[PDB]
Design a protein around this ligand. Structure first.
Ligand SMILES: [K+]
Ligand SMILES: [K+]
Ligand SMILES: [K+]
Length: 153
């Protein structure tokens, strides 16, 4: 897992102007890239994600290729995590999965557990800690947890 800064934990599409610049500085220092000028790539995430490798190489001819590849690795990891959330919580939309990941700082395990607890919380009509405790006892089997709750409506 790419050790992105918590400041840049958000998905690239959600990056702001200041965020993209933070990613450039984090990238040039973490991977010893050639110094990249903030004046270049002065844009938000949506624009950065619309730059081809040629475009990248236009802004920075000595680091554009590496920066483009790093953006691809980040994007592939995001899509993998979203898929992981979807495999464990059937019915979650692509948007609900990325929202749940945003709410746990990109931690897939935590996002899955939050989504499962949110489903059970409505049945339990009790505390979040109560829903969380029940689910964890049943090893996050929502159907087993639900049956336990349903016997004690
Ligand atoms: K791009
Ligand atoms: K219990
Ligand atoms: K009860």
């Amino acid at each position: 897992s790419i050790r992105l800064p918590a400041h840049l934990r958000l998905q690239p599409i959600y990056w702001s102007r200041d965020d993209v610049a933070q990613w450039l500085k984090w990238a040039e220092n973490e991977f010893s890239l050639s110094p990249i000028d903030s004046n270049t790539f002065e844009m938000n995430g949506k624009a950065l994600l619309e730059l081809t490798k040629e475009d990248f190489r236009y802004r920075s001819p000595h680091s554009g290729d590496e920066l483009y590849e790093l953006l691809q690795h980040i994007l592939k990891e995001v899509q993998r995590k979203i898929m992981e959330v979807e495999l464990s919580v059937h019915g979650v939309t692509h948007q609900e999965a990325q929202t749940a990941l945003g709410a746990t700082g990109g931690d897939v395990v935590s996002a899955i557990r939050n989504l499962k607890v949110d489903q059970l919380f409505h049945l339990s009509s009790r505390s979040r800690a109560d829903a969380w405790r029940i689910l964890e006892h049943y090893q996050w089997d929502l159907s087993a947890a639900s049956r336990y709750v349903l016997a004690r409506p």
